[PDB]
Amino acid sequence: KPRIPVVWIHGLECTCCTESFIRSAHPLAKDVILSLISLDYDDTLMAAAGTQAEEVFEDIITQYNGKYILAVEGNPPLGEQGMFCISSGRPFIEKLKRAAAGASAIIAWGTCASWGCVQAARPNPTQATPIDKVITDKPIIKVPGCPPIPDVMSAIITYMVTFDRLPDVDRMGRPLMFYGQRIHDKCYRRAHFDAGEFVQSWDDDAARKGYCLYKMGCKGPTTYNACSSTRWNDGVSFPIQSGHGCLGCAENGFWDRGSFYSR
Amino acid sequence: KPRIPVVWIHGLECTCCTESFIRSAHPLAKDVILSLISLDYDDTLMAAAGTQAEEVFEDIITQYNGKYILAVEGNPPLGEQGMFCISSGRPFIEKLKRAAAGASAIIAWGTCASWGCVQAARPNPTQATPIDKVITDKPIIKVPGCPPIPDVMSAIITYMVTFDRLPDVDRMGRPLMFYGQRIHDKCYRRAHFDAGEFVQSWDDDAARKGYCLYKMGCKGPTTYNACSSTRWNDGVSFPIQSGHGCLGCAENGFWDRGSFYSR
Amino acid sequence: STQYETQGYTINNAGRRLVVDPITRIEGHMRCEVNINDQNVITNAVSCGTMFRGLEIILQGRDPRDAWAFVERICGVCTGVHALASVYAIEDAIGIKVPDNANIIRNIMLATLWCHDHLVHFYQLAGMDWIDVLDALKADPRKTSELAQSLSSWPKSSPGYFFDVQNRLKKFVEGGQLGIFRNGYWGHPQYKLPPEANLMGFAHYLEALDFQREIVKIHAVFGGKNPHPNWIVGGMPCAINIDESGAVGAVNMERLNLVQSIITRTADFINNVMIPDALAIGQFNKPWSEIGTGLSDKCVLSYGAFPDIANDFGEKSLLMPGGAVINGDFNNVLPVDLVDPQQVQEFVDHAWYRYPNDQVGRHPFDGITDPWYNPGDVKGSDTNIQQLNEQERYSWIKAPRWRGNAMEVGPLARTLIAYHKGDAATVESVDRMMSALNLPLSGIQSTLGRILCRAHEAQWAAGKLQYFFDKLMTNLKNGNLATASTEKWEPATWPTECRGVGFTEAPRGALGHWAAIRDGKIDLYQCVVPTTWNASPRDPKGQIGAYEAALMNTKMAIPEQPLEILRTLHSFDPCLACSTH
Amino acid sequence: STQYETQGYTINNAGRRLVVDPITRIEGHMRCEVNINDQNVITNAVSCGTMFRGLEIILQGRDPRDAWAFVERICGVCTGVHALASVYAIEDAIGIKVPDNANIIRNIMLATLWCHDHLVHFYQLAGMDWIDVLDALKADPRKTSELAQSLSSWPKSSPGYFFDVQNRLKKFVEGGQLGIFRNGYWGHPQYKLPPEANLMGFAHYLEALDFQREIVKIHAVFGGKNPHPNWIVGGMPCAINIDESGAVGAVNMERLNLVQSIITRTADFINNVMIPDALAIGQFNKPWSEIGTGLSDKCVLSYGAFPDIANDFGEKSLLMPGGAVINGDFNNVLPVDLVDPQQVQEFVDHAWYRYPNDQVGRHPFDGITDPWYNPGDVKGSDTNIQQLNEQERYSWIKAPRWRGNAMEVGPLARTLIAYHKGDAATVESVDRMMSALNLPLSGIQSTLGRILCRAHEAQWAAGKLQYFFDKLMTNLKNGNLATASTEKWEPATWPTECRGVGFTEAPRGALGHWAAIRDGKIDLYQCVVPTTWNASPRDPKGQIGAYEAALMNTKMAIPEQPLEILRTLHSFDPCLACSTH
Numbered sequence A, B: 001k002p003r004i005p006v007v008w009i010h011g012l013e014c015t016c017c018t019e020s021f022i023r024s025a026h027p028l029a030k031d032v033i034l035s036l037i038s039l040d041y042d043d044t045l046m047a048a049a050g051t052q053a054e055e056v057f058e059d060i061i062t063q064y065n066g067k068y069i070l071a072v073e074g075n076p077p078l079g080e081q082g083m084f085c086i087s088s089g090r091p092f093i094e095k096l097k098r099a100a101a102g103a104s105a106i107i108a109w110g111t112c113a114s115w116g117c118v119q120a121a122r123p124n125p126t127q128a129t130p131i132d133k134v135i136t137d138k139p140i141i142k143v144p145g146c147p148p149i150p151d152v153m154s155a156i157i158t159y160m161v162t163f164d165r166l167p168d169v170d171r172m173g174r175p176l177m178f179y180g181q182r183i184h185d186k187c188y189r190r191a192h193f194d195a196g197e198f199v200q201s202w203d204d205d206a207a208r209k210g211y212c213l214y215k216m217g218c219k220g221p222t223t224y225n226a227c228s229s230t231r232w233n234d235g236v237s238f239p240i241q242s243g244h245g246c247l248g249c250a251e252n253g254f255w256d257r258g259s260f261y262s263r
Numbered sequence C, D: 001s002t003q004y005e006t007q008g009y010t011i012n013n014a015g016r017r018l019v020v021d022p023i024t025r026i027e028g029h030m031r032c033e034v035n036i037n038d039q040n041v042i043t044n045a046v047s048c049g050t051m052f053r054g055l056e057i058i059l060q061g062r063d064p065r066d067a068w069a070f071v072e073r074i075c076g077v078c079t080g081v082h083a084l085a086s087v088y089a090i091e092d093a094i095g096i097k098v099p100d101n102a103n104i105i106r107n108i109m110l111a112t113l114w115c116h117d118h119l120v121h122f123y124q125l126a127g128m129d130w131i132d133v134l135d136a137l138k139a140d141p142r143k144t145s146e147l148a149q150s151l152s153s154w155p156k157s158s159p160g161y162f163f164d165v166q167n168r169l170k171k172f173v174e175g176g177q178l179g180i181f182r183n184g185y186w187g188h189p190q191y192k193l194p195p196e197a198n199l200m201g202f203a204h205y206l207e208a209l210d211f212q213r214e215i216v217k218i219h220a221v222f223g224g225k226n227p228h229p230n231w232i233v234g235g236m237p238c239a240i241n242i243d244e245s246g247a248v249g250a251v252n253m254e255r256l257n258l259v260q261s262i263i264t265r266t267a268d269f270i271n272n273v274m275i276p277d278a279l280a281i282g283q284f285n286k287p288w289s290e291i292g293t294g295l296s297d298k299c300v301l302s303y304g305a306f307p308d309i310a311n312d313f314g315e316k317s318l319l320m321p322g323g324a325v326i327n328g329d330f331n332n333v334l335p336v337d338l339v340d341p342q343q344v345q346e347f348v349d350h351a352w353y354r355y356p357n358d359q360v361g362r363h364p365f366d367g368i369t370d371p372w373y374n375p376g377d378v379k380g381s382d383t384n385i386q387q388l389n390e391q392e393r394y395s396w397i398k399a400p401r402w403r404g405n406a407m408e409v410g411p412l413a414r415t416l417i418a419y420h421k422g423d424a425a426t427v428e429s430v431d432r433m434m435s436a437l438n439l440p441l442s443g444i445q446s447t448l449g450r451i452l453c454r455a456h457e458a459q460w461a462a463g464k465l466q467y468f469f470d471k472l473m474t475n476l477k478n479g480n481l482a483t484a485s486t487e488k489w490e491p492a493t494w495p496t497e498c499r500g501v502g503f504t505e506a507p508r509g510a511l512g513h514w515a516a517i518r519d520g521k522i523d524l525y526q527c528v529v530p531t532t533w534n535a536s537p538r539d540p541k542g543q544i545g546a547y548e549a550a551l552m553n554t555k556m557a558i559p560e561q562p563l564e565i566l567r568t569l570h571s572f573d574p575c576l577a578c579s580t581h
């Protein structure tokens, strides 16, 4: 039985979202690739390079025109005529637009593809621009986070395959299932926040008892994601559980909202 | 080097604490048994039965007198001259006293050994009685819960082996490490409690959003355990996370504090 | 000494008495006594439950909604099955119908338990009766690899692996701290595996000890924790949310994905490790296809289980068939009615309880649990028993009968009922299994058969897990999310007076909870549990239960070493806390 | 067309020009061009970083305590290594000393990254250069089992396992949806594994893809999450509490138990899967011990890493040795000083950056990152590069040099440095490894050698993980719990003006961050990253970097299929996001 074609492209990025994806515990990324989708193009993992890789890209988007999911990691830079990110000798943005034209839907993996992430932080030397400001005629699902949670990435994929539809989204295009509530709305340290029980300096008695990290700059109260419920790396931990405040890494512009250690 | 001798006996019980122990994810129960302790007597797992089992019991408590840890699951009944629980044709309490006399330290696994649990609930037909009302001359470490968390049980054992000491305890003899704080003090639904966001009937919209279970009878506010932090079954869940209020199962007398669905 | 005839046996308590107390590698407390003749053949067998807690007394006056949580604690091994029977019983009493997803999830919880419980029983409880652990030290690792690879596609089969396992065992025993292996029956002539099969089985023991912890993660998702997951009257508390805000607070796609992962791994381990080991034990121990028959060729009972049509407990709904066979007439599978006062009855003439008339049996709606420790004329005293007196009261276990008949329950019983009702899957599985051992169908009616059927059932349940999961996903795709009915949650909505029966097939056999509610409180709560059936003492007619019958006529190589007794008893997977409750 | 001589090479851009853009199975964006002569031998090689983001610019004006979080996002493959360099650099500037447990935990973080990164590189990035995946479909499962079992004790070796893997690949390919295998180089004559070895390799590819997810659970415990864990200036935020109330809110015995379980499994996987596979690739591809030497017999560089004495970055502290060899003189390992302005310098005469004078190299404390896209005549347009012009500016990667020498960094570099400084464990490992292959020491200075050293480093790091964990547990036994120093947390405690260097050995080689702090903010932040060295463009003397040199003189069987180019480039584990930052 044919598997849904997926084309995964990469603009300016650090590849954290790809790494997160392969961390998936259930389904294993192995089984996603072998059984759930047809990962037909992916610079990180594909055998073919150069002209062979160009041939795959062209053939897939032509043969499956209108029928493939386009996964985008990273973003296009508008600076230097787009040549801050070059693919096959041309601006990455050209490859993005070609891939986007034939996609049935687009998944914007990570804060990079969703909003801009670190390259878009002040002063944004490359004019890195999120996908939805360039591609304006396609369904875009934003899956923000730096990176998003591995089992959230795989859960969105399985949802799309199992249910044959896109996840329902909030007003920003984030899946309601995992971005409907704030970190702080499901945080196991909320008891301490409510009681005014705060870490005041690193490794103080409060820190050794798991007190709330708000006064250490935790941005949980304004950040939407599943870290405090689904957690990270097969439920093992999340930033706050291991003693660091939320940075806000799922939210648009989080790098430029002041020090991670201030209010 | 030799491994620390452990004698594990069973009074009136359901064997839930033994089952919990073998669930341990880290270290595996296999590695505990093969490499960390010498599990020298255990009715559930040992090859020998009958007179061969009695010989093991006698040989171990004699040869390792003053040097073994005694683990107790379940409790002695005082009713019917103790013959509500019979071992080798005699009241269980005689085996408990004999085992206790030679032990360096006693672990009371579970609410049964610690407090009474279900057999001691009204009207306590057998006069089931917790270990520390019978054994009054030895250190008893209470590890309550019905059963305790698998990885809590194994962590207590690894603590004893690694650090060559008993865990520090509260005034009830529970290890501070896992029983120092309340379920409700580390509950990920506390935000909802604080906001007055409650499940009012099962599978209502509040339930489907993971609202607080207080109005459905949750006893987290008065229960000390690690369920809301360490969680259950290699961190997969805990009662509240899967939609049921805490029963209070780590607390003395929790069966007789009224309906699980009442305040 | 006396002698009498019952059920084709000669019960003779002349001659040497052997006592095995405690029985180990079971749940809870059992004592077994036998008499052996000059030929070292058992001519008398005595089953004694040596514990009681009194849940049926404790439940009086409780809220029916709480009952599941109390009776779950009947047993931590068969954890969840009593909760399931409880919610069934209270729903039956009050007139509650649950939503389809709640039913499917309950079926998942039960199938998960079958898988886990059967697996652990096979390796950790029964396994060392068949596998000579110390003999594994003598195996050749390469011949072990070759054996394992001849039996299974299972990956973990390298000579280096078997060598590593062997060296782990060598180091374990080198300091003379043999732990659970100390003073075992190793070298007994009834140990028939070659060293390579012992090393293979011992490797699998360790793998099973590790792997079993994963299976119960399904219980953790739907029921919060294992052991002792949570339930509700009206469905399950694990509210579902796939595609809405706050799915992070509910059973969502990521939680279902975890369940699917465990299901696949569970099926693979059962099919490629447990199944071939069960067959191997069969291949090396064929004489045990003719030992420990007991009641299994006369009287067998199943209530049936796994209703596929929500709130329908009829024959068209139950995926695991119900029925009763008596008089060895497997041509006549009889329907079971748990309300009929002439069907299920419990006797206490040979148990530590009081009845107004101990010469008759009481249906559980008329049940009485009035404990009376009265061992009468024992050798010894009432606090120091050297020999039970089986001519009077000798157990904390009541004696259930079906239309006055003594019945065997559990995996072999169910397999026989399903086979003779013409269940296609069961017929195929049993035929293929007995064909591989070159044994007749009758070879299943035995100690070895009980073990073969248990492995079979583990495979069956692993398949049903996928079926149920798929049904749940089908509903979710159709927008059907409901997991609880709450229109009768409040006591004021219940009948002032009502009664109900909750039944299922637990890992060890037919389970029933009978509940009467009056004025919002439990008026009566009687449990009849599978090990109550199997470990039953005698009745007024002197009829013996399943354990006592299966032990009759058994040869012992060495009287002082009860390996043959343990083999047969362990084959029924005794749960003594269950039996007595 | 021109020709010139440098570093013993003849750089000749006569003949056919070949373009490989994009380079795949790397991190980020790279372009490579070569010229080949009439014998299909490479006479010119052009390394081009095709991406830039500008983290050095973005970091200006940030709080120094925040810097680690920004620079961590230089790379999600070598995730954490930039955070470590950053906290080192800020601590070095301000004069902060961290507690021992913070240092130990940092070393655990780094060793975990080495294990994870090296494993994924071997299988998922480099593997398909050496394993013909499609050829696995022709393998005999029994012969595959036999091979696997001759090479390793690893359990998973059954014929049935290899058949199941093969059948999975068969069904995957059957429908024509070859996914990541589409339009590969399968059947190329440089694929030399027999079919059994390809099936073994492919099975291990899948096992490694699964297993790698577990390794990073260590990062999750101490650092909250992976990718991109959390750190602090002053130590780590993962406060420890073993035996006090509220241990549930901290790193406790259960958390440390998790870490130990991961360490053991990580060592087992690397030692019994990756190491044998690496040796097997050696055995079947011995000619690649003489291909892609490049600079590895001339100039190699390590800064050193893993300070075992907290806050001591000296030679007696670093477990992974630092040093430089130039001019092929491995008898004189030279000391490296990252403050010395005559040592590390970056040139941009062949890169897309402005300097006031592009003929001079700038030490990072004098570094400038002023992007200037200026490809000159590229046979197309500014937005359509048909052929880079390597006579002018052709990369977003700066050109680092050490005392004006072009250096190779990474596992092979580090192995050579440690070996020639007389590290006993390295000497013994290397000698044994090259003996087993029946190859001279010189065979390590090669594309094959880079892969062998990477694998041996995964093994080294897995060993060090245990050593570091043991040291942590020793401190906790002695009551030493501290994980953070906060004496100089507040900006009011810092020097008004200060600067510092943070350095380590990332998976790909020598890493440095140079930071200058003024008035509580980052005034300057310059990064020189291992792939910046290796993938370097040319300098004013026309000296070529490690990649260009390694590609020089290489035979291609089939010019249109760049398998030899991919092999050598992949052997360096290119991280282009790292290289450009």
Ligand code: SF4
Pocket: A183, A184, A185, A187, A188, A189, A190, A191, A193, A211, A212, A213, A214, A218, A219, A220, A221, A240, A245, A246
């Ligand atoms: S740690 Fe952060 S998310 Fe959690 S309660 Fe405190 S402020 Fe809210």
Ligand code: SF4
Pocket: B183, B184, B185, B187, B188, B189, B190, B191, B193, B211, B212, B213, B214, B218, B219, B220, B221, B240, B245, B246
């Ligand atoms: S669910 Fe229970 S423990 Fe959690 S916040 Fe509500 S009342 Fe407290």
Ligand code: FCO
Pocket: C075, C078, C081, C082, C506, C507, C508, C509, C511, C529, C530, C531, C532, C575, C578, C579
């Ligand atoms: N299976 C099981 Fe336990 C018994 N007997 C119950 O019910």
Ligand code: FCO
Pocket: D075, D078, D081, D082, D506, D507, D508, D509, D511, D529, D530, D531, D532, D574, D575, D578, D579
């Ligand atoms: N390893 C690595 Fe990434 C590179 N190059 C860094 O630093």
Ligand code: SF3
Pocket: A013, A014, A015, A016, A017, A018, A073, A074, A109, A110, A111, A112, A113, A117, A118, A145, A146, A147, D073, D076
């Ligand atoms: Fe996963 S590429 Fe990593 S930086 Fe923040 S999302 Fe971007």
Ligand code: SF3
Pocket: B013, B014, B015, B016, B017, B018, B073, B074, B109, B110, B111, B112, B113, B117, B118, B145, B146, B147, C073, C076
């Ligand atoms: Fe683990 S035996 Fe189970 S009932 Fe409550 S603790 Fe008791």
Ligand code: F3S
Pocket: A145, A146, A183, A223, A224, A225, A227, A238, A239, A240, A245, A246, A247, A248, A249, A250, D225
């Ligand atoms: S920093 Fe990011 S990973 Fe989660 S806890 Fe905050 S949204």
Ligand code: F3S
Pocket: B145, B146, B183, B223, B224, B225, B227, B238, B239, B240, B245, B246, B247, B248, B249, B250, C225
């Ligand atoms: S019922 Fe028990 S298992 Fe934990 S959540 Fe409450 S203490």
Ligand SMILES: [Cl-]
Pocket: A008, A009, A010, A011, A043, A087, A095
């Ligand atoms: Cl791309």
Ligand SMILES: [Cl-]
Pocket: A111, A115, A116, A117, A118, A120, A251, A252, A253, A254, A255
């Ligand atoms: Cl952003």
Ligand SMILES: [Cl-]
Pocket: B008, B009, B010, B011, B043, B087, B095
């Ligand atoms: Cl005992």
Ligand SMILES: [Cl-]
Pocket: B111, B115, B116, B117, B118, B120, B251, B252, B253, B254, B255
């Ligand atoms: Cl209690």
Ligand SMILES: [Mg+2]
Pocket: C056, C398, C526, C527, C528, C529, C580, C581
């Ligand atoms: Mg009863």
Ligand SMILES: [Mg+2]
Pocket: D056, D398, D526, D527, D528, D581
């Ligand atoms: Mg730089």
Ligand code: NI
Pocket: C027, C074, C075, C076, C077, C078, C079, C575, C576, C577, C578
């Ligand atoms: Ni039971």
Ligand code: NI
Pocket: D027, D074, D075, D076, D077, D078, D079, D575, D576, D577, D578
């Ligand atoms: Ni990198």
